[PDB]
Amino acid sequence: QDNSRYTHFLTQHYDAKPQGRDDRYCESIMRRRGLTSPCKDINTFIHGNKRSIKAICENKNGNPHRENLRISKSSFQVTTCKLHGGSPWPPCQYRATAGFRNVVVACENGLPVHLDQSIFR
């Protein structure tokens, strides 16, 4: 029916139109999306519409990749938020890295349920 994992994916990895994707963007959205207790070490948000991202799950915008993942054909505007300061607890200071590249996800039932973070490390 519903997919709580696709819902979690959106919360953790999707931001439709961010505007300025600087450090303070990261600090605000990381707190907003509930990722600051403890501070998530690295988290990347995808921008634009959701139908492009879903389409990574189909032949449309994706290919099978590695053990059980999928890799997009199209590039996406992304913003990676990376923790600095060696303390895992708030306040969480983030460095933003805007990117434009293809993304790796895992899908269930045609829906993204996981973002592979490693390609942004």
Annotated binding site: 21-22, 81, 103
CATH superfamily to which 1-121 belongs = Ribonuclease A-like domain (3.10.130.10)
CA distance 47 to 24: 17
- Cβ-based neighbour number of residue 103 at 10 Å: 25
This structure's resolution (angstroms)? 2.4
Please count the residues of the chain: 121
Contact call for residues 79 and 98 (beta carbons, < 8 A)? yes
* Class of residue 56 by CB neighbours under 10 A (exposed 0-12, middle 13-18, buried 19+): buried
| PDB experimental method | X-ray
Q: Which has the closest alpha carbon to 66: 116, 3, 12, 6?
A: 116
CA distance 19 to 110: 29
Active site residues: 13, 114
All structural domains of the chain with their residue ranges: 1-121
Annotated binding site for tRNA: 21-22, 81, 103
CA distance 121 to 114: 16
